[PDB]
Amino acid sequence: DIATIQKLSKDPRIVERVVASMAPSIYGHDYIKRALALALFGGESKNPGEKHKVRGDINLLICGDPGTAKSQFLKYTEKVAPRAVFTTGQGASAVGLYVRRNPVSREWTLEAGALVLADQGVCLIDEFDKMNDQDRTSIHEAMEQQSISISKAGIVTSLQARCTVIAAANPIGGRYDPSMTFSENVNLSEPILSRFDVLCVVKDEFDPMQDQQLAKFVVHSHMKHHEIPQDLLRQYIVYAKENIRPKLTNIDEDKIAKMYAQLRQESFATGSLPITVRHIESVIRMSEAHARMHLRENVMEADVSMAIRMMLESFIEAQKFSVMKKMRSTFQKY
Amino acid sequence: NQQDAQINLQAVKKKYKEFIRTFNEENFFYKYRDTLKRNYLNGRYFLEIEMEDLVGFDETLADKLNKQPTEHLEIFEEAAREVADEITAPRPEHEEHMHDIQILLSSNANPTNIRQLKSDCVSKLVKIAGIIVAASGISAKATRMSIQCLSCSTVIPNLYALPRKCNTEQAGRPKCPLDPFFIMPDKCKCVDFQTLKLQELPDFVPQGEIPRHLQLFCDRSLCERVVPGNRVLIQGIYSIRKVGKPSRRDGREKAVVGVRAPYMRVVGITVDSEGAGAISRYSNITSDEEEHFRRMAASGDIYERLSQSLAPSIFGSRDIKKAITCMLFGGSRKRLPDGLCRRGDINVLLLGDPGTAKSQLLKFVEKVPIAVYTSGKGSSTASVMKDPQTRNFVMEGAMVLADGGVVCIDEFDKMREDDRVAIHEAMEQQTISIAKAGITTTLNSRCSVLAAANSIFGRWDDTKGEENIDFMPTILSRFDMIFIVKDIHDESRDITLAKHIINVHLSSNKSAPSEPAEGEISLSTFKKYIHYCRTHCGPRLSEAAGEKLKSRYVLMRSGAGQQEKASDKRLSIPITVRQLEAVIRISESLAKIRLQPFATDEHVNEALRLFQVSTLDAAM
DNA sequence: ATCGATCGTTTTTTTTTTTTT
DNA sequence: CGATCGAT
Ligand SMILES: Nc1ncnc2c1ncn2[C@@H]1O[C@H](COP(=O)(O)OP(=O)(O)OP(=O)(O)O)[C@@H](O)[C@H]1O
Ligand SMILES: Nc1ncnc2c1ncn2[C@@H]1O[C@H](COP(=O)(O)OP(=O)(O)OP(=O)(O)O)[C@@H](O)[C@H]1O
């Protein structure tokens, strides 16, 4: 009962069976389900010669509603995924609990954060967006340079921060804006805007049929008194991000340039909120993520085109009532 | 002397003694006699050795050498002096007196890791590779001495018991018992002692943890050998200082059973060759190297080739990069008999839209002789501690670790101003001052600095006028070449960035077809090249350069003032003495590269066009 | 068993710098 | 100031 993997793990329908074990909580919301599903085990170091170490990292973000269930989405991640720590918004001043090393004070206890304390894993945030700007400063390298570097003690040593990042914040403006622009929805400074990722949002409008469907599901959920189990896929992802080490090959990597141009030409000063050369490479992260969801190690148009599917949906998500830019632009792509 | 095995004599008797007389190849080089004698001639008192010569000689010693090296490696010393003192005789008349010597060891076996230096790996020879932090001063140690009580040079195996009987007993029956020992250091000796240090690697279980480290030891010639912040290859040995298991349990509530302490002593440190792993202070470089150097300096196609050395995976920013390396060489510390030590090293600014590879670039400028990187929230008040042994107030004082190196930082914007001012100042006079506790030691050190930043409001500030910095213009003062970073659009630029990095980002791509580019090679070479070229040439101007540069700065200030008047309000950067005082250092960097001492103004029209970027940046 | 001559015996301090919220 | 240790 160990080939539990390879009695099943190679079917074509298993693109979506992973979604059924994210959080068995929500009727809707396939998108973030799939996004966290891929990003829980995706990753590649691909250290080229002496330059740098690229990423075992991503920052998916959902800036939704103050009270749509978001903070519950996070916990099953921890209850399956191998590492963590719990932290909520309003952490330290981002310094952390800068010591000088003496046998006075009996060693003047020592640490610098928690990405120092949990690398190549997770450690949790909730309800961030109403926190000290003096932390939104501080965490703003470890995400991408994946490197720490300190001073201001008896020492200037340095240490490794290879991680990813939880998101869990809260919007401003009451609940959530219309399709009117996003930079107006929550106001974070210019040199933080740099990185960005899996852009989803719990925008709400009322359907009574769906209200009936899910509410049946809810009361059914409240009616349990006394495809995948959590019994297994835990180990699938241990295996998947530990042992197999995927790749890429030239198949269609020029198409990426036309779509980046589709950003820059359809989006200049309307929506295109400095989404530089990190999210593009996050394209690759999705593709490599997909093939490790397959234990493939290479791929054809499939995985990359799935990345294009999801991104095409999202960037239509976060526009104006004029909401169909890449939609009209990609019926030919689609 | 139990002549059965492990004997005191057999080794020294002939074996080690004759190994070297016997060590032979024609060409009549291949001994260690020549090296020994010619070392002696210049006061060296050592020589270098392998550990896989025994395979060249035998099959027994080495698997006995590893076991009790502490003895074998002094039998080596004795054999060394007796086999060399025969040659100290030109005839019997010019050994005025013999002398003591130190042996070395080396190999290419394999480096280990600190996580395994364990109870099995003890009293045993080894190899590792770590990095250096700091280590002590130079205290003392010796080997033997006499005492008036007995008048015998007190001979020891270990590097203390002092028994009862008097030995000034020839006093009649009125003897002097109870240990009356008068140490006679007229009759003692003296060797060195330095306590080297060792941190572990940056990839070998620091991951879910922190890195540990280790402290060290030396005797005679490996002081003045290692400056800290360096990458070592090592052969040492893992041994203790104290001893005991039974219920004499230590201290007050210490030592459940038997815990004694670690350390290592060195038997044959060497260094690293990460390209040029260890090329920082000494010179084992050879005439071929220097020919190579000067003949590339002779090459008049070296600078533009060097514009393409940091960006083999990066596109663009070439006018930006015509002086990103000129920072490294430094100009001239043209000091004068009065105070005016006009500013030696060089400093740079850069700031603009993210997504433009500032972090990786500064990581690389660290990569390519000596440097460090933190950024904000925190290298270096300077540090006045208080010694937990004896409680004295010593000064660790860490721009000291750029005492000729350079510095790079971003995150000047994102750290508060309680700690900017000592460093606001250092980089105009290079003298770290101190006045805090009972000490007035105006320290100093020649560091430069690289300054990246982040403007809040991005290119909005850069479109219209004065929101350039958020903090002050007095550090708009100290820097010469200052660079916007924008990401202005163009689809050609877009696609070209697209494939340019993907062809990078694909399959760990460019191993074979990378270096086949022209001459853009070996940052190792640049470590060596830099540590050379700065260490010799002390140029300064030619006459024809001075007038045109002078008139150019004149017109610079006139144009700044006219933009002040062409807007009826101050539209300028302050036309400082610092601007010329720095462009002089840009000329100096150029002449440092090509090694021609006297530099002409065509050499520096390049400088003119590069700081013109700063001029036309703060033009608005 | 008793006495005496043998052996070996040591402890005293208060305060300043940078750091974090 | 204490215990060891030797002989008487
Ligand atoms: N599909 C669902 N299944 C179960 N519970 C749901 C679902 N949708 C919404 N909820 C409920 O909505 C509530 C949302 O509150 P929660 O504890 O998630 O704080 P939050 O929504 O993260 O708010 P904030 O982050 O603004 O503090 C939860 O109690 C959750 O049970
Ligand atoms: N023009 C480019 N060509 C190739 N690679 C690039 C380019 N621009 C960025 N990259 C890659 O994108 C990443 C940029 O991250 P980096 O830490 O430089 O951000 P940054 O530009 O410093 O932004 P900030 O200054 O706000 O931190 C790097 O890993 C770099 O390799």
Side-chain angles (χ1 to χ4, degrees), chain B residues 10-11 15-16 19 53-54 57-68 72 76:
Chain B
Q10 156 169 331
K15 180 157 283 196
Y16 290 8
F19 149 66
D53 62 330
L54 308 196
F57 196 104
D58 66 316
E59 298 164 50
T60 69
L61 284 186
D63 201 358
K64 198 199 301 193
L65 196 58
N66 284 60
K67 305 296 187 75
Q68 319 92 329
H72 291 193
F76 250 59

PDB file of all heavy atoms in Angstrom, chain B residues 10-11 15-16 19 53-54 57-68 72 76:
ATOM      1  N   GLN B  10      63.624   4.418  14.863  1.00  0.00           N
ATOM      2  CA  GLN B  10      63.527   3.915  13.489  1.00  0.00           C
ATOM      3  C   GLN B  10      63.180   4.951  12.435  1.00  0.00           C
ATOM      4  O   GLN B  10      63.757   4.971  11.344  1.00  0.00           O
ATOM      5  CB  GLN B  10      62.434   2.845  13.440  1.00  0.00           C
ATOM      6  CG  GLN B  10      61.778   2.591  12.071  1.00  0.00           C
ATOM      7  CD  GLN B  10      60.909   1.353  12.054  1.00  0.00           C
ATOM      8  OE1 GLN B  10      61.148   0.394  12.786  1.00  0.00           O
ATOM      9  NE2 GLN B  10      59.849   1.400  11.258  1.00  0.00           N
ATOM     10  N   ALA B  11      62.227   5.806  12.760  1.00  0.00           N
ATOM     11  CA  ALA B  11      61.822   6.872  11.873  1.00  0.00           C
ATOM     12  C   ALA B  11      62.988   7.814  11.666  1.00  0.00           C
ATOM     13  O   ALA B  11      63.548   7.922  10.570  1.00  0.00           O
ATOM     14  CB  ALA B  11      60.620   7.598  12.453  1.00  0.00           C
ATOM     15  N   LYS B  15      64.966   6.898   8.274  1.00  0.00           N
ATOM     16  CA  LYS B  15      63.902   6.855   7.281  1.00  0.00           C
ATOM     17  C   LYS B  15      63.502   8.251   6.851  1.00  0.00           C
ATOM     18  O   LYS B  15      63.680   8.640   5.692  1.00  0.00           O
ATOM     19  CB  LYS B  15      62.702   6.118   7.845  1.00  0.00           C
ATOM     20  CG  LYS B  15      61.583   6.044   6.858  1.00  0.00           C
ATOM     21  CD  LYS B  15      60.634   4.900   7.144  1.00  0.00           C
ATOM     22  CE  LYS B  15      61.170   3.558   6.734  1.00  0.00           C
ATOM     23  NZ  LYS B  15      60.082   2.548   6.682  1.00  0.00           N
ATOM     24  N   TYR B  16      62.986   9.024   7.786  1.00  0.00           N
ATOM     25  CA  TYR B  16      62.668  10.408   7.509  1.00  0.00           C
ATOM     26  C   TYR B  16      63.915  11.172   7.159  1.00  0.00           C
ATOM     27  O   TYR B  16      63.883  12.103   6.351  1.00  0.00           O
ATOM     28  CB  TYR B  16      62.055  11.015   8.751  1.00  0.00           C
ATOM     29  CG  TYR B  16      60.685  10.535   9.130  1.00  0.00           C
ATOM     30  CD1 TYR B  16      60.070   9.480   8.489  1.00  0.00           C
ATOM     31  CD2 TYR B  16      60.039  11.094  10.199  1.00  0.00           C
ATOM     32  CE1 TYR B  16      58.839   9.055   8.867  1.00  0.00           C
ATOM     33  CE2 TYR B  16      58.808  10.676  10.577  1.00  0.00           C
ATOM     34  CZ  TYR B  16      58.210   9.653   9.912  1.00  0.00           C
ATOM     35  OH  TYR B  16      56.967   9.231  10.292  1.00  0.00           O
ATOM     36  N   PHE B  19      64.719  10.287   3.531  1.00  0.00           N
ATOM     37  CA  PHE B  19      63.649  10.475   2.569  1.00  0.00           C
ATOM     38  C   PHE B  19      63.987  11.611   1.615  1.00  0.00           C
ATOM     39  O   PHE B  19      63.783  11.490   0.404  1.00  0.00           O
ATOM     40  CB  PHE B  19      62.338  10.696   3.324  1.00  0.00           C
ATOM     41  CG  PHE B  19      61.373  11.560   2.630  1.00  0.00           C
ATOM     42  CD1 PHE B  19      60.803  11.167   1.456  1.00  0.00           C
ATOM     43  CD2 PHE B  19      61.011  12.758   3.167  1.00  0.00           C
ATOM     44  CE1 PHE B  19      59.904  11.972   0.829  1.00  0.00           C
ATOM     45  CE2 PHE B  19      60.120  13.569   2.532  1.00  0.00           C
ATOM     46  CZ  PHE B  19      59.568  13.174   1.366  1.00  0.00           C
ATOM     47  N   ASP B  53      53.242  11.620  -0.849  1.00  0.00           N
ATOM     48  CA  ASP B  53      54.571  11.197  -1.230  1.00  0.00           C
ATOM     49  C   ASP B  53      54.895   9.850  -0.635  1.00  0.00           C
ATOM     50  O   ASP B  53      55.691   9.097  -1.205  1.00  0.00           O
ATOM     51  CB  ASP B  53      55.601  12.185  -0.731  1.00  0.00           C
ATOM     52  CG  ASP B  53      55.611  12.270   0.771  1.00  0.00           C
ATOM     53  OD1 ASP B  53      54.537  12.062   1.364  1.00  0.00           O
ATOM     54  OD2 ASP B  53      56.672  12.500   1.366  1.00  0.00           O
ATOM     55  N   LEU B  54      54.300   9.544   0.516  1.00  0.00           N
ATOM     56  CA  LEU B  54      54.516   8.247   1.133  1.00  0.00           C
ATOM     57  C   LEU B  54      54.106   7.140   0.194  1.00  0.00           C
ATOM     58  O   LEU B  54      54.780   6.118   0.099  1.00  0.00           O
ATOM     59  CB  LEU B  54      53.746   8.143   2.438  1.00  0.00           C
ATOM     60  CG  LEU B  54      53.969   9.284   3.428  1.00  0.00           C
ATOM     61  CD1 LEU B  54      53.473   8.866   4.809  1.00  0.00           C
ATOM     62  CD2 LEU B  54      55.428   9.772   3.478  1.00  0.00           C
ATOM     63  N   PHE B  57      56.801   6.697  -1.756  1.00  0.00           N
ATOM     64  CA  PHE B  57      57.947   6.169  -1.027  1.00  0.00           C
ATOM     65  C   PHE B  57      57.701   4.811  -0.407  1.00  0.00           C
ATOM     66  O   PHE B  57      58.632   4.010  -0.323  1.00  0.00           O
ATOM     67  CB  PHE B  57      58.320   7.115   0.116  1.00  0.00           C
ATOM     68  CG  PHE B  57      59.686   6.888   0.695  1.00  0.00           C
ATOM     69  CD1 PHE B  57      60.714   7.742   0.377  1.00  0.00           C
ATOM     70  CD2 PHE B  57      59.925   5.895   1.615  1.00  0.00           C
ATOM     71  CE1 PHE B  57      61.957   7.571   0.909  1.00  0.00           C
ATOM     72  CE2 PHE B  57      61.179   5.711   2.140  1.00  0.00           C
ATOM     73  CZ  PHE B  57      62.193   6.561   1.793  1.00  0.00           C
ATOM     74  N   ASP B  58      56.485   4.527   0.016  1.00  0.00           N
ATOM     75  CA  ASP B  58      56.217   3.425   0.934  1.00  0.00           C
ATOM     76  C   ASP B  58      54.709   3.203   1.003  1.00  0.00           C
ATOM     77  O   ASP B  58      53.948   3.700   0.164  1.00  0.00           O
ATOM     78  CB  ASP B  58      56.824   3.687   2.314  1.00  0.00           C
ATOM     79  CG  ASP B  58      56.181   4.836   3.023  1.00  0.00           C
ATOM     80  OD1 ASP B  58      55.962   5.871   2.374  1.00  0.00           O
ATOM     81  OD2 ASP B  58      55.948   4.727   4.245  1.00  0.00           O
ATOM     82  N   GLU B  59      54.285   2.394   1.978  1.00  0.00           N
ATOM     83  CA  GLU B  59      52.879   2.052   2.150  1.00  0.00           C
ATOM     84  C   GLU B  59      52.483   1.948   3.626  1.00  0.00           C
ATOM     85  O   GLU B  59      51.433   1.370   3.930  1.00  0.00           O
ATOM     86  CB  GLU B  59      52.553   0.724   1.423  1.00  0.00           C
ATOM     87  CG  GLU B  59      52.757   0.731  -0.094  1.00  0.00           C
ATOM     88  CD  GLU B  59      52.790  -0.655  -0.680  1.00  0.00           C
ATOM     89  OE1 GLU B  59      51.876  -1.450  -0.384  1.00  0.00           O
ATOM     90  OE2 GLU B  59      53.734  -0.949  -1.440  1.00  0.00           O
ATOM     91  N   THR B  60      53.289   2.480   4.548  1.00  0.00           N
ATOM     92  CA  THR B  60      53.134   2.201   5.970  1.00  0.00           C
ATOM     93  C   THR B  60      52.996   3.454   6.815  1.00  0.00           C
ATOM     94  O   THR B  60      52.171   3.484   7.732  1.00  0.00           O
ATOM     95  CB  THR B  60      54.313   1.405   6.474  1.00  0.00           C
ATOM     96  OG1 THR B  60      55.475   2.237   6.460  1.00  0.00           O
ATOM     97  CG2 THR B  60      54.512   0.227   5.597  1.00  0.00           C
ATOM     98  N   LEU B  61      53.832   4.459   6.555  1.00  0.00           N
ATOM     99  CA  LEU B  61      53.887   5.627   7.425  1.00  0.00           C
ATOM    100  C   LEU B  61      52.529   6.290   7.562  1.00  0.00           C
ATOM    101  O   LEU B  61      52.069   6.557   8.675  1.00  0.00           O
ATOM    102  CB  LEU B  61      54.862   6.651   6.880  1.00  0.00           C
ATOM    103  CG  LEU B  61      56.357   6.538   6.973  1.00  0.00           C
ATOM    104  CD1 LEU B  61      56.908   7.825   6.449  1.00  0.00           C
ATOM    105  CD2 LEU B  61      56.772   6.359   8.357  1.00  0.00           C
ATOM    106  N   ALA B  62      51.876   6.561   6.432  1.00  0.00           N
ATOM    107  CA  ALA B  62      50.694   7.411   6.420  1.00  0.00           C
ATOM    108  C   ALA B  62      49.589   6.846   7.302  1.00  0.00           C
ATOM    109  O   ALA B  62      49.037   7.555   8.151  1.00  0.00           O
ATOM    110  CB  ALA B  62      50.209   7.584   4.987  1.00  0.00           C
ATOM    111  N   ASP B  63      49.285   5.557   7.154  1.00  0.00           N
ATOM    112  CA  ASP B  63      48.331   4.914   8.049  1.00  0.00           C
ATOM    113  C   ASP B  63      48.879   4.744   9.457  1.00  0.00           C
ATOM    114  O   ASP B  63      48.152   4.261  10.329  1.00  0.00           O
ATOM    115  CB  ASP B  63      47.933   3.545   7.495  1.00  0.00           C
ATOM    116  CG  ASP B  63      46.608   3.036   8.047  1.00  0.00           C
ATOM    117  OD1 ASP B  63      45.993   3.721   8.887  1.00  0.00           O
ATOM    118  OD2 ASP B  63      46.174   1.939   7.632  1.00  0.00           O
ATOM    119  N   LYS B  64      50.143   5.093   9.688  1.00  0.00           N
ATOM    120  CA  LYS B  64      50.665   5.355  11.014  1.00  0.00           C
ATOM    121  C   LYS B  64      50.808   6.837  11.309  1.00  0.00           C
ATOM    122  O   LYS B  64      50.851   7.219  12.482  1.00  0.00           O
ATOM    123  CB  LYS B  64      52.028   4.696  11.144  1.00  0.00           C
ATOM    124  CG  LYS B  64      52.521   4.502  12.531  1.00  0.00           C
ATOM    125  CD  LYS B  64      54.017   4.299  12.528  1.00  0.00           C
ATOM    126  CE  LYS B  64      54.426   3.094  11.699  1.00  0.00           C
ATOM    127  NZ  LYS B  64      55.832   2.680  11.923  1.00  0.00           N
ATOM    128  N   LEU B  65      50.902   7.671  10.271  1.00  0.00           N
ATOM    129  CA  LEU B  65      50.996   9.109  10.484  1.00  0.00           C
ATOM    130  C   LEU B  65      49.689   9.698  10.977  1.00  0.00           C
ATOM    131  O   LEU B  65      49.676  10.565  11.857  1.00  0.00           O
ATOM    132  CB  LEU B  65      51.390   9.782   9.173  1.00  0.00           C
ATOM    133  CG  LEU B  65      51.908  11.210   9.213  1.00  0.00           C
ATOM    134  CD1 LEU B  65      53.110  11.316  10.083  1.00  0.00           C
ATOM    135  CD2 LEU B  65      52.219  11.683   7.830  1.00  0.00           C
ATOM    136  N   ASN B  66      48.578   9.216  10.438  1.00  0.00           N
ATOM    137  CA  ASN B  66      47.278   9.700  10.867  1.00  0.00           C
ATOM    138  C   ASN B  66      47.000   9.347  12.318  1.00  0.00           C
ATOM    139  O   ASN B  66      46.215  10.029  12.980  1.00  0.00           O
ATOM    140  CB  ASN B  66      46.211   9.233   9.901  1.00  0.00           C
ATOM    141  CG  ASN B  66      46.240  10.046   8.607  1.00  0.00           C
ATOM    142  OD1 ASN B  66      47.252  10.067   7.912  1.00  0.00           O
ATOM    143  ND2 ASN B  66      45.170  10.776   8.324  1.00  0.00           N
ATOM    144  N   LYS B  67      47.630   8.300  12.837  1.00  0.00           N
ATOM    145  CA  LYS B  67      47.223   7.745  14.115  1.00  0.00           C
ATOM    146  C   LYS B  67      47.826   8.541  15.260  1.00  0.00           C
ATOM    147  O   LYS B  67      47.105   8.966  16.167  1.00  0.00           O
ATOM    148  CB  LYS B  67      47.643   6.289  14.217  1.00  0.00           C
ATOM    149  CG  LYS B  67      47.156   5.394  13.109  1.00  0.00           C
ATOM    150  CD  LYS B  67      45.669   5.266  13.077  1.00  0.00           C
ATOM    151  CE  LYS B  67      45.257   4.220  12.066  1.00  0.00           C
ATOM    152  NZ  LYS B  67      45.505   2.841  12.558  1.00  0.00           N
ATOM    153  N   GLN B  68      49.140   8.747  15.245  1.00  0.00           N
ATOM    154  CA  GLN B  68      49.825   9.542  16.270  1.00  0.00           C
ATOM    155  C   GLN B  68      50.652  10.626  15.594  1.00  0.00           C
ATOM    156  O   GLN B  68      51.872  10.698  15.758  1.00  0.00           O
ATOM    157  CB  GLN B  68      50.703   8.664  17.154  1.00  0.00           C
ATOM    158  CG  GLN B  68      50.088   7.354  17.540  1.00  0.00           C
ATOM    159  CD  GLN B  68      50.458   6.261  16.575  1.00  0.00           C
ATOM    160  OE1 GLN B  68      50.672   6.510  15.391  1.00  0.00           O
ATOM    161  NE2 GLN B  68      50.545   5.038  17.076  1.00  0.00           N
ATOM    162  N   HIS B  72      55.015  12.120  15.205  1.00  0.00           N
ATOM    163  CA  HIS B  72      55.657  12.011  13.909  1.00  0.00           C
ATOM    164  C   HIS B  72      56.026  13.382  13.378  1.00  0.00           C
ATOM    165  O   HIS B  72      57.098  13.563  12.791  1.00  0.00           O
ATOM    166  CB  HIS B  72      54.729  11.303  12.935  1.00  0.00           C
ATOM    167  CG  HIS B  72      54.518   9.858  13.230  1.00  0.00           C
ATOM    168  ND1 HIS B  72      53.933   8.999  12.329  1.00  0.00           N
ATOM    169  CD2 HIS B  72      54.811   9.116  14.320  1.00  0.00           C
ATOM    170  CE1 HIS B  72      53.866   7.792  12.854  1.00  0.00           C
ATOM    171  NE2 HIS B  72      54.398   7.834  14.060  1.00  0.00           N
ATOM    172  N   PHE B  76      59.748  14.653  12.498  1.00  0.00           N
ATOM    173  CA  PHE B  76      60.030  15.389  11.283  1.00  0.00           C
ATOM    174  C   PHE B  76      60.891  16.603  11.563  1.00  0.00           C
ATOM    175  O   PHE B  76      61.855  16.864  10.842  1.00  0.00           O
ATOM    176  CB  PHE B  76      58.741  15.805  10.615  1.00  0.00           C
ATOM    177  CG  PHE B  76      58.475  15.085   9.365  1.00  0.00           C
ATOM    178  CD1 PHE B  76      58.377  13.726   9.373  1.00  0.00           C
ATOM    179  CD2 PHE B  76      58.320  15.759   8.188  1.00  0.00           C
ATOM    180  CE1 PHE B  76      58.154  13.021   8.229  1.00  0.00           C
ATOM    181  CE2 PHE B  76      58.083  15.080   7.034  1.00  0.00           C
ATOM    182  CZ  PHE B  76      57.998  13.692   7.055  1.00  0.00           C
TER     183      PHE B  76
END
